[PDB]
Amino acid sequence: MAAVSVYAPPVGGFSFDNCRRNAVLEADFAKRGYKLPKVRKTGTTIAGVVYKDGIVLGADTNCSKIHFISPNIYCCGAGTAADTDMTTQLISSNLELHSLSTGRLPRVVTANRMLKQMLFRYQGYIGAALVLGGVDVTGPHLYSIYPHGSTDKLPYVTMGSGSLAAMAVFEDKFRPDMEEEEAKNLVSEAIAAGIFNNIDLCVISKNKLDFLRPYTVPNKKGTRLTTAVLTEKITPLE
Amino acid sequence: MSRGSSAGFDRHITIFSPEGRLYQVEYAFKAINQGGLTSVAVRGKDCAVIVTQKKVPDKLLDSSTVTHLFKITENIGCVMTGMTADSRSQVQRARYEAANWKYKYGYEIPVDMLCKRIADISQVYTQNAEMRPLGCCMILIGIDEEQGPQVYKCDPAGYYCGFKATAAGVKQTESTSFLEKKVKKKFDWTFEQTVETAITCLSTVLSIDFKPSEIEVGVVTVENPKFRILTEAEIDAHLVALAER
Amino acid sequence: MALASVLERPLPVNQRGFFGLGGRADLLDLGPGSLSDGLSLAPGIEMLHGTTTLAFKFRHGVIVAADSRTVKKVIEINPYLLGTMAGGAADCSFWERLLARQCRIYELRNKERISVAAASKLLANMVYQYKGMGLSMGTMICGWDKRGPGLYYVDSEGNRISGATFSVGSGSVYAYGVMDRGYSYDLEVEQAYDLARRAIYQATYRDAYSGGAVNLYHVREDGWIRVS
Amino acid sequence: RYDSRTTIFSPEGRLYQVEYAMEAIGHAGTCLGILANDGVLLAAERRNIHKLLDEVFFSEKIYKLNEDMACSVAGITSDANVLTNELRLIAQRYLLQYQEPIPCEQLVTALCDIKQAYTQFGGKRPFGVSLLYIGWDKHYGFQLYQSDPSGNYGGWKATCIGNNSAAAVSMLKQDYKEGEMTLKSALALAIKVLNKTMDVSKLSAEKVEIATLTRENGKTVIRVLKQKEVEQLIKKHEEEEAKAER
Amino acid sequence: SYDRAITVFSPDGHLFQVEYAQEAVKKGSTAVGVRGRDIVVLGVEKKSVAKLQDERTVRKICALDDNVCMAFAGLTADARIVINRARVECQSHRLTVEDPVTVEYITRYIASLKQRYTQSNGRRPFGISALIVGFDFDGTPRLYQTDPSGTYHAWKANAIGRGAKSVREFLEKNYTDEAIETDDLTIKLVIKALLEVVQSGGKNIELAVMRRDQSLKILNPEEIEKYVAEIEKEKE
Amino acid sequence: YNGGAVMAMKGKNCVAIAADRRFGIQAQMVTTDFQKIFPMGDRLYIGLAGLATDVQTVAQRLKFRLNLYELKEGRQIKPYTLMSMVANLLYEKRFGPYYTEPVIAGLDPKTFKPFICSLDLIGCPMVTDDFVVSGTCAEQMYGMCESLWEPNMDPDHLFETISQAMLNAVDRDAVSGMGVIVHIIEKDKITTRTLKARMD
Amino acid sequence: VEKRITSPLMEPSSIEKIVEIDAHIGCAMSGLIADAKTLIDKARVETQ
Amino acid sequence: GTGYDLSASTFSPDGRVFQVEYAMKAVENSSTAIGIRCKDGVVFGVEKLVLSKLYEEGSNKRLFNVDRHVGMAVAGLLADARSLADIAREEASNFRSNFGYNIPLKHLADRVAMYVHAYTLYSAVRPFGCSFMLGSYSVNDGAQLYMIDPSGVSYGYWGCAIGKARQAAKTEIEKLQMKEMTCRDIVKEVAKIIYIVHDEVKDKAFELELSWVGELTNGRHEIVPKDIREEAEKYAKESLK
Amino acid sequence: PVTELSASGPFESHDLLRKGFSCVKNELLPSHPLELSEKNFQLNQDKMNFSTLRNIQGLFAPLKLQMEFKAVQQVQRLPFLSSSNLSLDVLRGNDETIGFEDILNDPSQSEVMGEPHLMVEYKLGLL
Amino acid sequence: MAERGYSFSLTTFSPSGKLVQIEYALAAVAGGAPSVGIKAANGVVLATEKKQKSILYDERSVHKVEPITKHIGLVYSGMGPDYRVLVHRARKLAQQYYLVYQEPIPTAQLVQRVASVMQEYTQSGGVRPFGVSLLICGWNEGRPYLFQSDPSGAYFAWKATAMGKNYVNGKTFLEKRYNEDLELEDAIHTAILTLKESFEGQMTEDNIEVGICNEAGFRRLTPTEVKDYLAA
């Protein structure tokens, strides 16, 4: 149409309009009790351990909190729901581009770097606290990235509401080099101790994963899972 | 020089000829021969070896400053063939790009990814009218993680490819024929056999019996992944061991 | 050097004095008393203030009048255009000096004098750009153009009101009253009313600070005059 | 004085590079547009008629821009792709700001400003595309515009662009009746003209694509005729030409 | 020392690229503008009308604001660009100073735009000349003309385009104070000037008048034919 | 200010989307009675509860993007793809969001399988297969929808159930001037009904 | 200055080769008018 | 290489950038500078040509101080040589500011040589028509001598000569066993070599410009003191005959 | 309190119809902490990279990167039409990463674009 | 052959309206290694000839048949570096489409976006067209796609095509042997035969490259699979 008020071409990214408007509007509404919409949070217990030849990642459930980042890397998220979703999707597509160029299946440190530098870029304003974990040619790696851009490479880690009970269970019963069943039971038990007042489980194992064949794109599927009336008007269409 | 494009089918980089050929890129390929030096890189069972001529035509010139083997990362080394300043500038660019990769991705750059990055930059040079190709060839070596030794060759056109053995310079065709004949027979050369192969290729296509001061050898090994440049004593040991046989 | 010049950044790395994420950066910020003087386009808490003013249109012109005297209460924009002061003294003086600069540039370009509507609109734009930043203006632009006598009230809050009777200040309420007027007053009778109105301000005061006579004015067709 | 740049006038005031840009369309396929009392149409010659070419998007040449407009390009195909994308963008920007569909001449004017900008700034090749627009708006009703590489548009009641546009225009000018055109007579005239100007081959309903625009129950209906209808039109023309002979 | 660059003087001191843009102007249809007493008139020849054309779309007389109008001769696409910039500038000036543009203000703006494009040999001048008629805010009729170089002057009557010289000779010999007394005489004088280059007159003539305090009015072919019939009667 | 309440339910090869209407109101301040449900397709609708200005802005920008998508791809958009477009727009605010929270309710134009969804103001979608609610009264709306929703409903039972849930959710013993508009999307037709509580 | 009026139909007041920069300065022009007026406006704005 | 030699971004049909070759000939346009590296330092010497008797002695110097420890001897266009002296000074100061110690001479040579090369790459700038030598001394590094030419190629030398008579001077340097001489004997021999290759008829009335950096200056670049320069000039004259 | 009113000389002229609604009153304190961090992110990343290149390698390295960036950004598309930045991304290293500038608020479908000539001659520094 | 400088500028039309620098970029494509695309009834085949034909090439290194997503794959004939730069761009565009719409990009959409990039490079001046013409094979909506995008940025949907050297004879060969009801296996046989038409000597599994696209997605055949196809 050619707007008269446009001199330079628009760019992409976050918009930052509505910022001052929302500040004034939220101060005004809070002085009247009007309850603007809020963001969805996903605070639930997420936990992970490294066993001898893999990791086990676990979460509470009715939802699915264990994200996909790579055929060898998976992620659990706590914090703002939209933030964990978008964060993991962006890093998953970046790791697809990386692997599709390199022809190698990704590295967990690459995902950790991407996540921590993206979360550092947005100065804690993206509320994604993650439990990253995967398996490369280097071995099983478990990380815990925090919304401000700080990671922590760990043997076991827990986040969410029951994180203290689950961390207590891990400090009680975690041993280096467990079996797949032992580690699976430990992660389930830590989650359960974190919920009581189902449980998802992701198992990435070194001997279920070939790091010598060329990388090929995986196939993906999807997620997200009286009184009487008086009809004043009716209007069928078509 | 100021600005514009030279008119002619072989006089600007962004002009095609009637046959769809970029002639300035081919002239850059001829610039690789400016220097009169040949480089051989040979990949073995568990090592990669780069061998280049070391001509120092000056008694007054400090010979420890003449070198064409460079260290890109701690575990990647390259032999540069072509114009000397262009070679050193492309080494500087490869060093920067490798450091950026380690920064962004948290692990050290592979060899194929480094030659791919350098070749992407070279393609950008061939497509734009302000820049020109570099008259140099980069042959990179490294030990990857699970593939093994790697020899890769970027070139002025932006083309790159992995090899089992490759050559650049004046005697590139003669060396390529020599190495083809060698690789058809057997290829699992241990470590000594790869060094002998590289030195024999260089000393056959040049018909020159070498001295430890007329030749440079840089190696990587699976057990010692770090790029290493052999001292004159080590090259002389290899040469005497080749001569006795 | 030629390469950094062909680049035309200028950015603090392609220069001299760079030793980190910045360093001295060609003078650690130190510079010069300007690179350009004026004659070209290029914490002190005690600013000054004003008091009482009238202004009515007419049949024979526009009549400004201010609470006597010293201090200044009417800015003399140029021979054909007047303006009063309220709020910050520096604000009124500076922005109407800029307005007189605009009016003279207009007259030079267009060979005819600016209209009062255009002049007041230029002033309203200049002070509206910095709305909410603390500018305090209460001017009142009056003149005479091809449309007859003109009278506008231009404010630092974006207001620009046309009218045939205005009044700003303390005695404003008493001075707008006592403004029992008619569009066809004789000139002497007009001077009479403006005198009487600034007086009915000061019938509760007398000559002193912002006190004296009436600093009367009169915008004729060929430019204003000072009646007394 | 010469013809190397778009930003150079010859010493008789001619912009030779723009004239050469406009010379590229005379190679392209014949696009024909006819305005009737109850609709508009676009008849376009399918230039790409090779055996191994796939059955493609609903039309090779006809593009939908709105709910209300369609275009039909002739010239360089890649420039045309860029230009139709920008047409659709311009129209959605008008709809976003005014909440009303863009009027047809405003869209044509905006695209032609883009094309003129490419004929005015140096170091930018003009668009070798001549478009042909058909639409409906509440101001002027059914409209048919034309545009050429110089960003120079005009509204017509019947026009042709592309190969043999001059013979087609002579035939339309001889046979188009102003005021007494209906969409069936416009389709007959389109087949007749598009036949006599495609004399490199015999006309068949595989080398022509026809799209009509009408208004039905308060909505515009841009419809690309099916292959089994263009055959019926061609038969009607052949029987007419047999009768008019003997 | 030649043409082929916009910003290069020839050894005689001529910028030839601007002069060739003015050559581009001298091929366009003739536009005649006459400034009257209380009416200002514009007339353009409709050169080589095609019968299958919507004439509304190829008009060469345009309104810039409610008091200013403009006819052009030259390349029509450049003219469209310049016209729309002038329209935005008329509205922007109203926003700046509340007062309607004087015809000189918008003439000056149009000339400054054309002059911006006569610099910088990476750009191309506008190959148009314009006849900007109008009424000032105090009611004075004006007629200005700009040319591709960025040069404007005020006229009493003028012609631009092909055959501007014959029409301007006719206007000089025939523009008096007795040809201006009424609105009708001004209209007939413009039509008579245009009939000096137009064959088969009346159907190749596009008149538009602007009376004081009134908007631009395009005369339909019926009114134009009535005026032409009056002219032939006055020929006796 | 009342943001409103938008609901959607699934039946058997049919979807329902409902929102309140505010028949009788002479309120003031920010707009209250706005249009909430926008047809985004032949069998696709979006409901937008929240600040009225942001509802209109989101609807208009969504229609911009959707119209462009449908012209470029030459196909009718699918409900899940509309969900993803809405999420992308909502999230491109994110730091200063739109105070709107949508529900998508439509029928897939290949198998006419119901799709319902509900996002938040930054676009985190929740795809359920029974019902969704969106608004400032989500708690009792959820309670009523859980108590009344039955699997494999038909258009009439769907209409009855969604009307009952809306009415008895916004109830507060205050259904006076409270209306409900209900669109029932089916493979063949779309039936819009505007209704009032019988108490009045 | 020599005016060189081209047509009798042209307002002489619009082709003035002597302009006023300020009340005490005046310019006489010769050459390209479009450039001259740029320099004249620079002078006027500079004086103000 | 006509037709392929107007830009520094054009390759000749045999892979030769000819603007860079013409820039190196530009270096051959000027009078000679030699630099000799010895057992305990580096000595520079320039056959500086007296343009006029009106110039204050010391003007048009061609022996710069690039850092406290580095000295630079130039040839070619003198404006280009001064710009490159400014660049080298900037590099040394920037390194010291970042990293807190004196820049190694090899690293300085790389930085400046890579600048010169960057000019040999574009159509927007022309190659530097100037060649220069850097020379330093550190207790932990020994004497070091580098020469950069207009193409951006820097090597390390034991003796270098740049300028008009680089070949004759190079022949004369090769006779010196500089690896086992101190800076004093090298100063005398540098003066001798400057006097030998001077062309007394074509060029006229030159003045020696001697400089050292060594352990006799404690790793600090300096002008050879007036008395030692007088002794060196007298030796050089008496050896010429 | 920003000071800086060039007000010594606040003689600048603006186009009123094209300036839209500008509020210099609030153009001194960004609307969000992340507003400028995101607006100038490629700028700040280039400055960080040029700084590390300068400090490690020398003047030549940022100069050559800036010269390549300037060259590729100049054989482009006129500002009223979207470009791909294919060569610029290959130079900067964004040919294999997707950020949030790439997926959010797509520049290719701007929802608002100015006049062709006005946008071209603004890029040319003519206003 | 310098038509008054109409030959050397990309932004100058010739007096006849030709742009004879984009058709010189089409002579780089017609001087590249042969490529074949055959759209069968249940899949597409992309067969090319490798330039890396000697024993000294690592064949886990660089490939001419590349995947864009799971369902889209490319081959080219022309200039290899231009192909690589366009391949990384096509992969980025596909991932942006996924990130926005949560669905794999359709083949036609990808072809359109890549062609717009190429067109941009044919209009500025100071830049050079791309010396590659791509073949894009994809599988969407239970329907195979074969497209071709040439240096000008103008893409074509094909049933079968041939690029690179000797492509007119290749297309003539393909016309006589392509039928719509062809199955993917017979398509692979026909594509290998069409490559064998214009081929420089004995054809091994190590000097040709094949990639297929069916319901399961795009896949590059291993040298053993190509060896088996060649043996029949």
Swiss-Prot record, chain A:
Listed EC numbers: 3.4.25.1
Disulfide partners: none
Active-site residues annotated for this sequence: 44
One of the protein's GO biological processes: proteasome-mediated ubiquitin-dependent protein catabolic process
Propeptide intervals in chain numbering: 1-43
Cellular component, GO annotation: cilium; cytoplasm; cytosol; extracellular region; ficolin-1-rich granule lumen; nuclear body; nucleoplasm; nucleus
Main location (coarse class): cytoplasm
Membrane-crossing residue ranges in chain numbering: none
InterPro entries: Ntn_hydrolases_N (IPR029055), Pept_T1A_subB (IPR000243), Proteasome_bsu_C (IPR024689), Proteasome_bsu_CS (IPR016050), Proteasome_sua/b (IPR001353), Proteasome_suB-type (IPR023333)
CDD domains reported in the protein's UniProt record: proteasome_beta_type_7
Tissue: Expressed at a low level in colonic mucosa. Up-regulated in colorectal cancer tissues.
Keyword Hydrolase: yes
Function description: Component of the 20S core proteasome complex involved in the proteolytic degradation of most intracellular proteins. This complex plays numerous essential roles within the cell by associating with different regulatory particles. Associated with two 19S regulatory particles, forms the 26S proteasome and thus participates in the ATP-dependent degradation of ubiquitinated proteins.
Family membership noted in the UniProt record: Belongs to the peptidase T1B family.
Protein name: Proteasome subunit beta type-7
Record gene name: PSMB7
Swiss-Prot record, chain G:
Subcellular location: Cytoplasm; Nucleus
Expressed in which tissues: Expressed in fetal brain (at protein level).
Superkingdom classification of source: Eukaryota
Residue list for modification Phosphothreonine: 6
Induction cue: Up-regulated in colon cancer cell lines. Up-regulated in fetal Down syndrome (DS) brain (at protein level). May be the target of the transcriptional activator NFE2L2.
Residues the record lists as Phosphoserine modifications: 7, 14
Quaternary structure and interacting proteins, as annotated: The 26S proteasome consists of a 20S proteasome core and two 19S regulatory subunits. The 20S proteasome core is a barrel-shaped complex made of 28 subunits that are arranged in four stacked rings. The two outer rings are each formed by seven alpha subunits, and the two inner rings are formed by seven beta subunits. The proteolytic activity is exerted by three beta-subunits PSMB5, PSMB6 and PSMB7. PSMA5 interacts directly with the PSMG1-PSMG2 heterodimer which promotes 20S proteasome assembly.
Function: Component of the 20S core proteasome complex involved in the proteolytic degradation of most intracellular proteins. This complex plays numerous essential roles within the cell by associating with different regulatory particles. Associated with two 19S regulatory particles, forms the 26S proteasome and thus participates in the ATP-dependent degradation of ubiquitinated proteins.
Protein family: Belongs to the peptidase T1A family.
Protein name, UniProt field: Proteasome subunit alpha type-5
The encoding gene: PSMA5
Residue range from the parent sequence: 50 to 97 of 241
Curated annotation (Swiss-Prot), chain H:
Residues bearing PTM Phosphoserine: 239
Keywords linked to the UniProt accession: Acetylation, Cytoplasm, Host-virus interaction, Nucleus, Phosphoprotein, Proteasome
UniProt entry tagged with the keyword Nucleus: yes
Induction: Down-regulated by antioxidants BO-653 and probucol. Up-regulated by bacterial lipopolysaccharides (LPS) and TNF.
A GO molecular-function descriptor: ubiquitin protein ligase binding
Top-level division of the source organism's lineage: Eukaryota
Full protein name: Proteasome subunit alpha type-3
Subunit record text: The 26S proteasome consists of a 20S proteasome core and two 19S regulatory subunits. The 20S proteasome core is a barrel-shaped complex made of 28 subunits that are arranged in four stacked rings. The two outer rings are each formed by seven alpha subunits, and the two inner rings are formed by seven beta subunits. The proteolytic activity is exerted by three beta-subunits PSMB5, PSMB6 and PSMB7. Interacts with AURKB. Interacts with CDKN1A. Interacts with MDM2 and RB1. Interacts with the C-terminus of TBXA2R isoform 2. Interacts with DNAJB2.
Gene name per UniProt: PSMA3
Keyword Nucleus carried by entry: yes
Primary location: cytoplasm
One Pfam family in the UniProt entry: Proteasome_A_N
Places the protein is found: Cytoplasm; Nucleus
GO CC entries: cytoplasm; cytosol; extracellular exosome; nucleoplasm; nucleus; proteasome complex; proteasome core complex; proteasome core complex, alpha-subunit complex
Native organism: Homo sapiens (Human)
Protein family (similarity comment): Belongs to the peptidase T1A family.
Matches recorded under PANTHER family: PROTEASOME SUBUNIT ALPHA/BETA (PTHR11599)
Post-translational modification N6-acetyllysine, affected residues: 53, 202, 226
GO biological process, one term: proteasome-mediated ubiquitin-dependent protein catabolic process
UniProtKB/Swiss-Prot annotation, chain I:
Superkingdom: Eukaryota
Motif High-affinity association with the preproteasome in this chain: 54-58
Encoding gene, per UniProt annotation: POMP
Induction trigger: By IFNG/IFN-gamma.
Per UniProt, location of the Glycyl lysine isopeptide (Lys-Gly) (interchain with G-Cter in SUMO2) cross-link in this chain: 25
Tissue: Strongly expressed from the basal layer to the granular layer of healthy epidermis, whereas in KLICK patients there is a gradual decrease of expression toward the granular layer.
Annotated organism of origin: Homo sapiens (Human)
GO biological process: proteasome assembly
Listed name of the protein: Proteasome maturation protein
